[PDB]
Amino acid sequence: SIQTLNLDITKVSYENGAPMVTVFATNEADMPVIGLANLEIKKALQLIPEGATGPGNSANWQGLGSSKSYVDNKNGSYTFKFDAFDSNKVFNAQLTQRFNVVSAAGKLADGTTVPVAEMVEDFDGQGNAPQYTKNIVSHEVCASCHVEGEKIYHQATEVETCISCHTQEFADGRGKPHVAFSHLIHNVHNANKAWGKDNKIPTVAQNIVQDNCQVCHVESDMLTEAKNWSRIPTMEVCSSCHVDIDFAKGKGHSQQLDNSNCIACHNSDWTAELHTAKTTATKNLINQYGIETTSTINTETKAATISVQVVDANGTAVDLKTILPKVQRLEIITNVGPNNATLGYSGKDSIFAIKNGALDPKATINDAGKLVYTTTKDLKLGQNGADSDTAFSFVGWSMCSSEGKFVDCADPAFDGVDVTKYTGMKADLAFATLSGKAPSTRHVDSVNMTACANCHTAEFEIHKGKQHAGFVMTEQLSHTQDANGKAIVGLDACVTCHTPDGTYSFANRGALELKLHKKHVEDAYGLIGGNCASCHSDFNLESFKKKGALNTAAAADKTGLYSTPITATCTTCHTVGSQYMVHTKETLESFGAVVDGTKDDATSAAQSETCFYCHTPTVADHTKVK
Ligand code: HEC
Ligand code: HEC
Ligand code: HEC
Ligand code: HEC
Ligand code: HEC
Ligand code: HEC
Ligand code: HEC
Ligand code: HEC
Ligand code: HEC
Ligand code: HEC
Ligand SMILES: [Ca+2]
Ligand SMILES: [Ca+2]
Ligand SMILES: [Ca+2]
Ligand SMILES: [Ca+2]
Ligand SMILES: [Ca+2]
């Protein structure tokens, strides 16, 4: 019923000693929300300033108590009092005062459902605006990778609530320095030491975050202490990733008995630069060059010729001859039928037109300086309906590089395993038709690269390694825009290999409709769960009318098994015969489906599924049925 619950602390009065605190609650239409049953001041704190506990030390949140005692004022406002304010007798009205307010998900009396809400707000010791703050991060950065509105590990859903409990005082009282939040937060994302009684090694978090301070520390005018990540070096925080130093004993580092001299040597400029240098260098290399790719079908031979024009950062032509010694790999993959690829993985056309500065004999550079390659696989243009009039070609490439500079590929046999030796570059996509009519294109309106980029960064070099140059996905291959006119960077190019027939094996669920689900429900469920919005803005259910069969398993003799396309898409996470699929195989067939059968039968029945008579999935709730 209520989509968003807004909370504001509108008044703080110390006129009776302990503060009286009024909160005003509104819904998404700014109407007052009356009848909240689980509103609480989870923490009352005050801010001990930087340096007060010792030279170089951080500011800290000193505890003053909590309260679940409040009156519903019947107008949207709620007024708290404290039965046991400041039981340690440390209150100091010269300090900034903070209240952390939480409302649990639940229902009002009438049964209106109400979602969780959390906030903090800061004041001076009289309830006016505060004079100074410790505002370093905000809760939004966490939502790039952890589902917003759900608990992150435990207790709460917004980082300021974590910070309000995991204080220096909290850590000291337990004798556990590592549970102060500014230690813990880096700890649980960095693999240099384990955490918890389970000794969990954060291998996955390490792979995603990659010690990239900028995914949490973002410059902002609303966060006046945002530069603290480079301006306040302390042994307590820096040791969370640098786990091998013993500052007291002078092991791995000169002895330091306190934090008084850290900043004298570790100046902010150096700490900021050194921890971001590698991502900055790589991103600078990626934005040096681009490519513009065209393709045309020869109407008589039915082969596509692909032309690649390197350009510089301004879009100005660059003869590929001038940089060929630095091109580590360039690959061209061509399939047919963008909405339902027809060549499969084995029948696709693919070539490394360049490898470590060498042109393949099947590719040339023409006098205009463009690279030119003509397909050799039978493209079967026009042999499977109107969609098969269109070939689509994915171009990925990489350039040799060292310490932020492009370099000559000096070793012809370099196998691409050592990714410190080269940079994946901006990939491209080109369309061509046999008929010469306008090409079909795949829908890109339900999932795009901005969502992938929230967790993997916009500079994600997909598949970089021994097998591929690394595909960086940008507006180079955009061919439509959203309702606000912003170019959509789609994943339709990935279908060149992620075909309805799978990838190199029939057992991988390699079709793009299945592959991203399989990978992330298996390896990212702690971050995503059933949160379809982590990738989707909506579902394009109409696209199923353009789909054929989808490969879902391999037979015992290694050949391919196929399902009808809706059933194939749902069963990646809802395996037939498992505890995750109430429908038996027999019931699914009764709904028109083919389940792990032959390509012919699955193709024949592909528009026979009745699933959407009952199922009406939306990204907000994909489980919805009539
Ligand atoms: C948008 C549709 C995408 C795409 C194209 C990819 N991702 Fe993710 N991903 C996430 C996590 C936690 C993992 C596991 C990492 C690990 O186990 O170490 C992955 C894995 C991948 C891969 C595998 C290759 C790799 O270098 O890891 C690939 C190719 C991939 N993903 C592509 C996390 C997320 C998300 C977290 C909420 C988001 C959203 C996405 N990924 C989105 C995408
Ligand atoms: C993407 C760049 C992320 C950002 C931004 C944040 N987190 Fe994260 N976190 C991320 C991953 C890939 C993992 C590993 C998940 C797994 O299943 O192993 C984590 C882990 C955590 C944890 C540990 C709990 C756990 O699930 O293992 C915590 C407590 C955590 N993350 C908190 C957290 C906070 C508070 C963030 C905002 C300051 C935040 N994360 C951002 C990925 C990313
Ligand atoms: C008090 C009201 C808390 C809130 C808010 C948050 N956490 Fe917490 N956390 C709390 C306690 C009492 C403990 C156990 C401390 C101990 O003595 O072991 C924890 C522990 C964690 C841990 C484990 C850390 C480790 O073992 O090294 C993590 C990763 C953690 N908490 C994460 C976390 C997050 C992300 C929070 C905000 C969403 C959060 N906690 C809030 C108490 C409280
Ligand atoms: C999200 C997963 C983060 C990443 C990645 C990095 N930091 Fe961080 N940092 C994060 C949080 C939630 C906090 C606590 C903020 C608070 O209000 O308490 C911090 C804190 C720090 C600090 C302490 C600043 C202080 O005033 O004492 C430092 C010095 C710091 N972080 C440094 C730092 C560096 C150098 C990082 C990249 C290598 C980095 N952080 C990443 C969240 C996250
Ligand atoms: C994990 C999120 C980290 C935190 C917190 C801090 N550092 Fe760091 N540090 C980290 C990495 C991944 C690296 C290597 C980066 C690279 O590209 O080489 C570093 C490196 C340093 C260095 C240089 C290495 C050396 O041998 O001295 C220094 C001087 C350094 N880091 C200092 C430093 C300080 C002062 C921190 C607290 C403010 C700090 N690091 C936190 C990862 C992480
Ligand atoms: C000058 C006398 C320094 C003082 C004071 C502090 N640090 Fe230091 N530190 C200094 C140097 C010259 C280096 C190595 C530089 C390099 O690039 O190799 C370091 C290293 C560190 C590191 C990184 C350790 C590693 O990656 O192996 C960290 C995390 C670090 N220093 C932290 C730190 C702290 C917390 C300090 C105050 C207690 C501190 N340093 C003071 C020079 C000097
Ligand atoms: C042929 C040149 C490919 C292109 C183009 C793309 N992918 Fe790929 N991918 C390919 C193979 C041979 C495999 C392994 C077999 C399998 O099907 O799993 C993969 C695997 C993936 C995975 C799973 C995790 C992994 O093994 O890395 C994902 C998530 C994936 N592929 C995604 C993906 C995307 C988003 C692409 C377009 C940018 C893309 N692939 C293109 C082969 C090829
Ligand atoms: C990123 C890791 C994803 C998550 C999380 C979810 N989906 Fe997805 N989905 C993803 C991709 C790359 C694709 C392929 C798009 C293409 O061009 O083929 C899909 C596809 C679907 C479809 C097909 C219709 C469409 O919009 O393309 C459906 C019905 C679908 N996905 C459902 C779905 C549901 C219900 C999810 C939450 C449990 C979900 N997806 C999550 C990537 C990702
Ligand atoms: C992985 C990306 C999934 C895809 C693809 C589909 N679903 Fe799903 N579904 C998924 C999860 C993680 C869950 C949660 C299970 C739990 O108990 O937490 C669900 C749940 C459902 C449900 C409700 C559960 C039930 O027993 O009925 C329904 C009705 C459902 N899912 C339907 C459904 C359909 C029709 C799909 C294809 C369009 C589909 N799901 C895909 C994860 C994923
Ligand atoms: C009405 C007669 C239905 C038809 C036609 C289809 N499904 Fe269904 N499905 C239906 C119900 C009442 C439920 C349970 C809803 C709940 O919340 O419990 C489901 C469930 C699913 C699920 C989730 C299963 C699970 O998590 O255990 C999936 C993935 C699913 N259904 C897929 C699906 C397919 C592929 C269909 C066409 C072949 C199909 N459903 C048709 C009701 C009905
Ligand atoms: Ca206010
Ligand atoms: Ca909030
Ligand atoms: Ca760690
Ligand atoms: Ca282009
Ligand atoms: Ca039909």
Numbering used by the authors: 45 to 670
What's in the article?
Bacterial multiheme cytochromes (MHCs) attract much attention for their contributions to extracellular electron transfer whereby electrons are exchanged across the cell boundary and consequently between internal enzymes and external redox partners. These processes evolved to allow the capture of electrons for anabolic reactions and the release of electrons from internal oxidation during anaerobic respiration. Thus, we investigated whether amber suppression in MR-1 could produce ncAA-containing MHCs and, specifically, variants of the MtrC protein, which contains ten c-type hemes. MtrC is found on the outer surface of MR-1 cells. MR-1 cells typically present MtrC tightly bound to the external face of the outer membrane spanning the MtrAB porin-cytochrome complex.
